[PDB]
Structure formats: structure tokens, C-alpha cells
Amino acid sequence: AVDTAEQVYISSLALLKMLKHGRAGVPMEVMGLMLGEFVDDYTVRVIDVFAMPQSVEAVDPVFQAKMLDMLKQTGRPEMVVGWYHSHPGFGCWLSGVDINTQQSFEALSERAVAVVVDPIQSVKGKVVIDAFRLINANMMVLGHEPRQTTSNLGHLNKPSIQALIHGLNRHYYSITINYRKNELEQKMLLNLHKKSWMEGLTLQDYSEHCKHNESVVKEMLELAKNYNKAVEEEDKMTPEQLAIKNVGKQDPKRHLEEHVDVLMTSNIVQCLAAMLDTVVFK
């Protein structure tokens, strides 16, 4: 018996169920169960996620047994592997009671996993997901992980400061997480932002189109007005004092490319679709 370089296998539904639950209960720690499968001594796999009511102490486990039952009879039976909750705008660190449920859980199952989530620090590009694993204190001097591979040591990331200020190595150990993707969900997830041929065959309008070009050309004239004075101006001031006196209201040479780009991309497609609609049709 010894630790390893463990891996956290996920379920794509699990992530969304996380973020929607925590976001909906954003002003407080929202709790829930992590349901999955113990694939081996090395890696874990979560496939199902769900939560319960909380007014953090969960109420009647009669929801528990009936929930897992009806989840077994429809679909199949599975195994509870861990759990999760939120640290809204927090250091995604196991709170004092959060660790207090951990001696409760690891005593039940060995590889009981805590799951920290914050729907606050997560930007649309990247989410701040987290999960931890309690460690004993009796072995505070004795080694805890054999470290037989670089992956969970010098191959992952670097512990953050706001959670290292709480445990960072102590009272628990971090764990790596990845994403397994079925090809079935993968293909449909690939395509969810395309439209039908109607969109690709629309001709927006030439009254508001020509009205629009008539718009942008107008102020673009003024942008050229400013651009003449600015470019010819050229105080011999060194290439950085210009970069300190340009903060303000100064903006030639910037809008000029922009309006040209937009006026390009409009007129181009606007002509092209009209072309196709006549070549192809009749």
C-alpha cells in the first residue's frame, strides 16, 4: 500500500453540473456528491454528479438511497467516489470543516476525493477547478507518496499561494485532473455554433448596408482630419514621451485601420452572396 501519481478522470456532464450548481448558489458554499468509478489503485474516474438541499449540513439521506436507487434502475448502478462544493471567490482551499468531513469520508472509502470549485475566478476561457485528497498527520515525518514518476511532481503545475497558505502539502495532498471525451459527445460538441444555409445565404440589406457605409465613411473622414495634423505634427520628443502624451484622447492611426477593415468585410461578403444567389439560382 502506497500512493502513486494518480489521475482524476472526469465526465463532461460533471463539469457543467459543477459550474451551474455553484453559480446558481454563488453567494455561499454549495455542496454536492461526486459519483464515479474506482478504475484502479492509480487513477480514478467520475461519471455522474448531483447535489442535494442545504439551508454546511446536508439534510435527510432518504434522498440519498432513493436517488442512487433510481439512478441504478434507470441507466445502471455505479459507485460513489468523492464529492464537491464551492469556495466562491476563495483560495479554493479545504476549509476547516471541509477537512472535517474528510476523516469522515476516507474512513468510509479509501480514495475519497474532495472537489473544490469556484464559478467566480473562472473566466470564459478557463475555469478554476480544483480537488484535494486528505493526508494523515501521524505520518508527518514518514514519507507519504513514493514518487515513482514525474507526473504528479515535476510534470504538473505549481501550488498557488492563497491555498498553500492553508495546506499546500499539509493535511492533504493535491491531485491531477484531466478530461476524457467520448467521440459521440465529441462530434456534436464540435458543432454547436453553426447555422443552416439560410444564414449563409442571407443578404442583410442594401438600405441599411449603404446607410451603414455612408455612416462609417463620414466619421472616417474626420479620423483622416485628425490623422493629417497628428502625423505631420511630430514633436521631436523621443519615441516614448509620445507614448506618454498619447494617453488622453489621442487616437489617429488606430481607428483608421479599423473602419477600413469593417468596411472591407461588409462590402466583400455583401457582394459575394449576391453573386452566388444569381449564378446558382435560375
Partner 1 sequence: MVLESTMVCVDNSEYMRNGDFLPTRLQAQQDAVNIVCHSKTRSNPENNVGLITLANDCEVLTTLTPDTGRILSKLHTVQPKGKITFCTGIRVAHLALKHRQGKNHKMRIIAFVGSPVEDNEKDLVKLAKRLKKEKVNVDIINFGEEEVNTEKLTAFVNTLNGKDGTGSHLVTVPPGPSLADALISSPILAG
Partner 2 sequence: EFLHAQEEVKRIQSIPLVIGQFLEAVDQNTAIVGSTTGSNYYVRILSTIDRELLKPNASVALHKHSNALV
Partner 3 sequence: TRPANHRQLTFEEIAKSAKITVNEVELLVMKALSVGLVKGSIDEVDKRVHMTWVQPRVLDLQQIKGMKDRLEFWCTDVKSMEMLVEHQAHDILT
Given the rule CB under 8 A, which residues bind partner 3? 276, 279-280, 282
| CB neighbour list of residue 159: distance below 8 Å, 6 or more residues apart | 168, 169, 174
Q: Please, what is the minimum distance in Å from the beta carbon of residue 201 to partner 3?
A: 11
Answer with the entry of partner 1, partner 2, partner 3, none that 76 interacts with (C-beta below 5 to 8 A by kind). none
Answer with the entry of partner 2, partner 1, Zn ion, none that 138 interacts with (C-beta below 5 to 8 A by kind). none
3-state secondary structure of 123: coil
212 is in an annotated binding site: no
- Residues within window 39-98 making contact with Zn ion, judged by CB under 5 A: 87, 95, 98
Nearer to partner 3, 153 or 201 (CB): 201
- Which amino acid, 61? P
- Residues within window 94-133 making contact with Zn ion, judged by CB under 5 A: 95, 98
Report the candidate in 126, 119, 121 with the shortest Cα–Cα distance to residue 22: 119
Query: Is 229 an interacting residue with respect to partner 2 (CB under 8 A)?
Result: no
87 is in an annotated binding site: yes
Q: What are the start-end ranges of the E strands in the chain?
A: 7-9, 31-37, 43-51, 79-86, 116-118, 128-129, 132-134, 172-174, 176-177
Q: What are the start-end ranges of the E strands in 121-225?
A: 128-129, 132-134, 172-174, 176-177
| Distance, CA of 257 to CA of 184 (rounded, Å) | 43
Q: Please, what is the minimum distance in Å from the beta carbon of residue 247 to partner 2?
A: 3
Report the candidate in 102, 108, 162, 105 with the shortest Cα–Cα distance to residue 137: 102
Per-residue contact string for residues 89-128; x = within reach of partner 2 by CB under 8 A: x------------------------------xxxxxxx-x
- Residues within window 49-108 making contact with partner 1, judged by CB under 8 A: 69, 72-73
CB 273 within 8 A of CB 201: yes
Checking DSSP bridges between strand 176-177 and strand 7-9, what pairing results, if any?
parallel
| Distance, CA of 189 to CA of 212 (rounded, Å) | 36
Answer with the entry of partner 2, Zn ion, partner 3, none that 141 interacts with (C-beta below 5 to 8 A by kind). none
| CB neighbour list of residue 101: distance below 8 Å, 6 or more residues apart | 83
Query: Is 6 an interacting residue with respect to Zn ion (CB under 5 A)?
Result: no
Query: Is 248 an interacting residue with respect to partner 2 (CB under 8 A)?
Result: yes
Centroid of chain to Cα 112 = 24
Answer with the entry of partner 2, partner 1, Zn ion, none that 261 interacts with (C-beta below 5 to 8 A by kind). none
- Which amino acid, 31? M
Q: Please, what is the minimum distance in Å from the beta carbon of residue 84 to partner 3?
A: 39
Answer with the entry of Zn ion, partner 3, partner 2, none that 195 interacts with (C-beta below 5 to 8 A by kind). none
21 is in an annotated binding site: no
Binding footprint of Zn ion on the chain (CB under 5 A): 87, 95, 98
Annotated binding-site members for Zn(2+):
85, 87, 98
Binding-site positions read 85, 87, 98
Residues within the interface to partner 2 (CB under 8 A):
89, 120-126, 128, 240, 243-244, 246-251
